[PDB]
Amino acid sequence: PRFTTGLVYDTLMLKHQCTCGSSSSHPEHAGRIQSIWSRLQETGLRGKCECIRGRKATLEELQTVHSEAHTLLYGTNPLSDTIWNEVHSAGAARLAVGCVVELVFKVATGELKNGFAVVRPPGHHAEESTPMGFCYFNSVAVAAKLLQQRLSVSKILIVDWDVHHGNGTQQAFYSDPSVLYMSLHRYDDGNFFPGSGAPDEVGTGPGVGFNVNMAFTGGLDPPMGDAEYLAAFRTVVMPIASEFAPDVVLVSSGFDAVEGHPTPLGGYNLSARCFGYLTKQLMGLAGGRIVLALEGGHDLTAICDASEACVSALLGNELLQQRPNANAVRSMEKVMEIHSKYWRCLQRH
Ligand SMILES: O=C(NO)[C@@H]1[C@H](c2ccccc2)[C@H]1c1ccc(-c2ncc(F)cn2)cc1
Ligand SMILES: [Zn+2]
Numbered sequence: 001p002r003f004t005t006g007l008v009y010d011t012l013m014l015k016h017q018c019t020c021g022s023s024s025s026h027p028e029h030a031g032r033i034q035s036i037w038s039r040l041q042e043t044g045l046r047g048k049c050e051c052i053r054g055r056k057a058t059l060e061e062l063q064t065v066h067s068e069a070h071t072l073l074y075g076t077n078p079l080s081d082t083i084w085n086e087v088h089s090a091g092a093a094r095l096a097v098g099c100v101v102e103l104v105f106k107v108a109t110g111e112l113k114n115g116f117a118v119v120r121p122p123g124h125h126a127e128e129s130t131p132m133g134f135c136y137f138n139s140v141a142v143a144a145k146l147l148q149q150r151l152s153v154s155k156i157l158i159v160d161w162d163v164h165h166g167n168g169t170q171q172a173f174y175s176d177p178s179v180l181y182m183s184l185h186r187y188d189d190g191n192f193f194p195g196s197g198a199p200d201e202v203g204t205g206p207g208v209g210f211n212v213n214m215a216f217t218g219g220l221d222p223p224m225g226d227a228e229y230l231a232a233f234r235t236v237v238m239p240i241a242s243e244f245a246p247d248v249v250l251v252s253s254g255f256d257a258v259e260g261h262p263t264p265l266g267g268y269n270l271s272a273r274c275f276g277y278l279t280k281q282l283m284g285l286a287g288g289r290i291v292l293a294l295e296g297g298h299d300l301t302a303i304c305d306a307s308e309a310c311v312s313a314l315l316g317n318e319l320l321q322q323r324p325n326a327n328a329v330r331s332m333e334k335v336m337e338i339h340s341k342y343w344r345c346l347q348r349h
């Protein structure tokens with residue numbers, strides 16, 4: 001077994017790719033994960049991590065999040081800007097889901113300490129019946145549902161540091177107080193992609209208070225960076241996360257917030273190293289039981305750097321104090337004042 005860092009990856013996920021085979025015309029391409037897998041090798045980090053085997057998720061599992069009609073449509077293949085290979089896409093989308101499910105279940109059962117899924121295509125945008133933002137099935141969401149249904153996990157924490165809002169995951173657990181969805185993302189008063197994820201969307205029914213949207217508003221004037229996300233974790237995420245006290249931690253790990261992402265695909269000035277410190281802060285929760293799933297991040301050098309930092313953090317290795325900008329303070333203060341009504345630590349904000 002080797003109670004240490006885990007990893008999952010499969011070459012069969014590469015075959016979800018347009019027949020034209022170009023990087024430029026389709027940002028979500030096979031090279032996104034292949035570059036990461038090769039970087040983890042070259043840095044020797046793969047040689048220290050245990051590499052688990054991935055499987056295709058069953059239609060029965062996929063329907064823990066999505067409708068049957070939807071799962072049959074993009075899960076089985078007989079005979080605009082979002083691609084779909086008619087031979088290999090169905091299998092790849094299911095492998096992405098299953099790869100996370102397998103890894104998450106290993107880390108949850110104290111077999112591995114923590115893990116990192118190098119999967120594609122992404123998931124957090126994918127709702128019950130509708131695919132958007134180059135997502136089809138919500139791999140992270142399915143893994144959480146299965147943890148509920150098959151390992152009786154009482155309290156799951158989903159952190160989503162992809163720069164875009166995970167509308168699908170928010171939808172999946174909106175009525176659920178046993179799952180806490182935390183999203184740090186570029187919002188800009190609802191005028192970014194996807195456009196949803198307002199701070200005041202706090203959940204519904206039994207799950208009122210367990211949906212937190214750390215929505216940055218004010219735009220790229222100035223752009224957000226390491227200090228602003230660190231302030232977010234320090235004053236909003238970790239406080240509410242520690243109070244929730246989850247048995248497992250899942251991370252919709254999009255690195256599109258990193259430097260070198262143009263103004264539709266990102267526009268923020270975070271560093272790869274910063275995601276190492278965020279991963280480190282999250283490791284303190286759930287007795288170390290954390291697993292990171294790959295979401296977005298087009299720029300290859302940015303995601304390869306960010307992945308190297310996160311995996312090293314998970315192993316237990318290492319590597320300033322800038323103030324958050326006025327817009328970050330203004331954004332953070334809007335979340336705390338809404339979530340003061342549901343969380344003890346924030347009562348007086
Ligand atoms: O980052 C993402 N999710 O986490 C999303 C998808 C993406 C994932 C991974 C690599 C590249 C792109 C990114 C994306 C962002 C924006 C848009 C978009 N869609 C419609 C528009 F009119 C304008 N932009 C479409 C897709
Ligand atoms: Zn094409």
Ligand SMILES: [Zn+2]
Binds near residue numbers: 162163
């Ligand atoms: Zn994104």
